[PDB]
């Protein structure tokens, strides 16, 4: 029940990510 | 009567002042981070009040009034208070006189919300409303009344029968005109006439100079130039020197901010008094002994002055 | 006009409730006070998590790791910073408190002048001519309901300073001389109630020469018809 | 929607010729309101009401209104 | 029946000085500000100078400042413009006008216009 | 969550530490112009110490 | 204070509403006038202040606007109405006339 501000999160909001049906690993990667 | 109403709005960027675009200094300043925010917030509050002060004194009636294009209202000249095209901002003769007499890092000055022209227009409206409608425009619908007859009402308030005015109308008009004529001379001759307003200007400037000067103090460090320390000592050692400067510069801001808060409070008190006089002295006839000049009060006229108001 | 006045008063009171409810910012002034205090207190609490240059912001940790000689140095940094944080807080409260005190004194004055009497100050107790005020308690403050009389429905008439009858100037003891069309009357200034000019309501000041604007008319005499 | 003001450059607001009562103060006599896009306009001091002034004319109120204020 | 009559417009060599007189009739001369306006043949109307009822407030166009003097005689009902250091650009049709206001206060505008006089500056 | 750098409105929320923002004008940032390049001017000295 | 008047020229048929816009460099409050100039005729004061018509001026002419932007509107064009129009600010000396707009039949 608190709002905390931190710099840990690394995913930019509303960013178009590459779509695939070797990819460089740059400062972490989000996989879905 | 001369009353200070507002002070210059100043905003200081704490980070830029303490650290000159130096990332190293900024990281050190992250410690005790709240301090920076508290300072900016405080100064912001001061700035907002200045606008509030001005509105309370001038923006009371929201209707514009114009006097008819006639030379004398029952022999009362009124020319000096009325607006003049020759004057720089379409201001009155007296107001023009008043404005002549008064004279980097992260520091910045924020423009006042109400421009001088707007304030000038407000004063004229108040003045016009009083000359044509007496004290009725501040209490509801403004109703016209011959100026000569209005003065008769004023005499009854002080306790003199109206016949006295009608039988000495000419004499009273001349006396009034003569007094107005002296006003211009008085302000010009007496250099210290607007000292009250001038003091406000000097104090603010003085304070700001001191703040700027403080940036050249070592506070115990090898140097007062941040870039030098950064350009000579290595990171571990530099930290120590930078901390000294940060501590000193930080203290300098707090002192400055504190003084402005106390000083601002004084101005606010003055503004409230000015607001009261505008309502009681200008928009009505006061019975208080010396609230509106010495003697038995009849009427008052408002004239804009830099960072303040002048009441006749 | 008792009935009319009563209805008007009742109607105005009815609107008060609606006004406060509709306007969310109606009690902003009182709300501001609450927020400022809370804001200040949050900041003070937050400051306890600042290192101020020490290895850590948790006192127990320093005590649980470094030895006494070294710990002193670290603790001093924290003490200095925390001490400064309090002074800043205290100073702000002093200045802020002064502002509230000024406000309280004004509130006290209004209670005595507006509520316990009828004030003649122009806008000390509401806009218009003040009649009476009622005090209502509000959290950390007071709300004053000001009842005022506002003139309305104005009409324009010709006016004269004095009336010349038999070479004698007549000045109205109370009111002003008004003329609709060709008839001259004397009326109270605030409200229009025309009455025939008579010796009773006017006084004689002199001849008819000095006054400028005097108009000729007849001043009725009450005694003459009986005689 | 790039406009130049004494306060500074203003973006995302559309200049409006009409003057309205101030809603959000931008400084230097400029105020911004949300009317739907944000609009920037010069504030208006007030409406113009002038009594006809004559040397023998007076206006007497014929009615009254009782008002309660908070 | 307010009539304003202009006189004194004539050919003048460049650098010479000329005087314009406007005669006022049919109204109270000392109760209104007076103005001078010139119509250039190839250009739109240009305001030249204005004077108040008592001569307290006087204004001049930037181009004519320092070379033109406006004076009025209330007793004679006459408006005078004195022109010095005349130049080719000055040639125009000059009109004496009557301001609705007194040059002070809240009411302004050029209510009445005279027929006008022609001034030509040439070598 | 709120991404402070996404847009000005988002940034305002971070500064006010509240998701809801009331009507008003809020100062949430400072603006600087970055240096285009670094220029070094030294004396022209050939002699070696 | 420069006054800019747009459009420089327009052509309209009889019975057509006409709008002329005058702009000011700095705020002039309500001090402005609209003047009608006809060939061989002295200029005439149509509107003074912002919207106050002079006595003897047909109702078709109307005045609008405040501060920087000002507008003059003729509800229906007439043969008599075809003349150049000028806007003069009265705010402060020196008073400045606008370039002027010429109205002519199509
Ligand atoms: C008011 O009444 C007086 C007296 O009846 C008028 O005085 C007369 O004024 C005329 C004009 O000047 C003279 O010829 C008479 O001789 C005056 N009579 C007396 C007895 O003095 C006065 O003029 C009237 N006022 C008005 C405005 O009609
Ligand atoms: C004074 O104003 C009141 C209203 O404030 C007038 O009362 C109204 O009269 C009209 C008829 O003329 C009724 O339809 C309304 O219902 C009345 N209102 C109330 C609240 O009673 C009153 O007539 C006015 N007095 C005069 C002399 O004009
Ligand atoms: C109102 O007062 C002004 C002065 O403030 C009078 O105008 C001056 O009159 C003198 C001569 O008496 C001139 O020399 C000045 O040039 C005038 N103007 C100024 C600004 O001083 C004016 O006469 C008075 N009004 C009346 C009706 O007497
Ligand atoms: C009221 O003013 C009007 C002009 O607006 C005038 O015609 C009328 O005669 C005036 N009323 C009286 C009683 O004089
Ligand atoms: C003026 O008002 C009174 C009021 O009773 C009336 O008797 C008189 O006839 C009126 N005169 C007019 C309307 O000319
Ligand atoms: C009132 O002014 C008029 C001019 O409009 C004048 O004729 C009349 O004499 C004046 N009245 C007084 C009492 O001065």
Residue numbers in the entry:
A (entry chain C): 46 to 66, 83 to 93
B (entry chain F): 725 to 827, 855 to 1063
C (entry chain C): 919 to 1145
D (entry chain C): 641 to 675, 690 to 724
E (entry chain D): 1 to 123
F (entry chain C): 288 to 336
G (entry chain E): 2 to 107
Paper text:
The Coronavirus Immunotherapeutic Consortium (CoVIC) conducted side-by-side comparisons of over 400 anti-SARS-CoV-2 spike therapeutic antibody candidates contributed by large and small companies as well as academic groups on multiple continents. High-throughput, high-resolution binning of CoVIC antibodies defines a broad and predictive landscape of antibody epitopes on the SARS-CoV-2 spike protein and identifies features associated with durable potency against multiple SARS-CoV-2 variants of concern and high in vivo efficacy. The S2 domain is conserved among human coronaviruses (63%–98% sequence similarity). Antibodies targeting the S2 domain appear to target three main epitopes: (1) residues ∼1,140–1,160 within the connector domain (CD) proximal to the virus membrane, (2) the flexible hinge (aa ∼980–1,006) that transitions from a bent hairpin to an extended α helix when the spike protein springs from a pre- to a post-fusion conformation, and (3) the fusion peptide (∼aa 815–835) near the border between the S1 and the S2 domains.
CoVIC-154, derived from Wuhan spike immunization of human B cell immune-repertoire Kymice, is predicted to bind the S2 domain and has several interesting biochemical features. Interestingly, the CoVIC-154 Fab bridges two adjacent monomers in the spike S2, with the Fab heavy chain contacting one monomer and the light chain contacting a second monomer. Overall, one Fab buries 1,121 Å2 total surface area across the two spike monomers and contacts residues that are highly conserved across SARS-CoV-2 variants. The CoVIC-154 Fab heavy chain also contacts the glycan linked at N801. From the light chain, residue Arg30 bonds to spike Ser813 and Glu868; residues Asp32, His91, and Tyr92 to spike Lys814; residue Asp50 to spike Lys790; and Tyr94 to spike Pro809. Beyond single-protomer interactions, light-chain residue Asn31 also hydrogen bonds to spike Glu702 of a neighboring protomer.
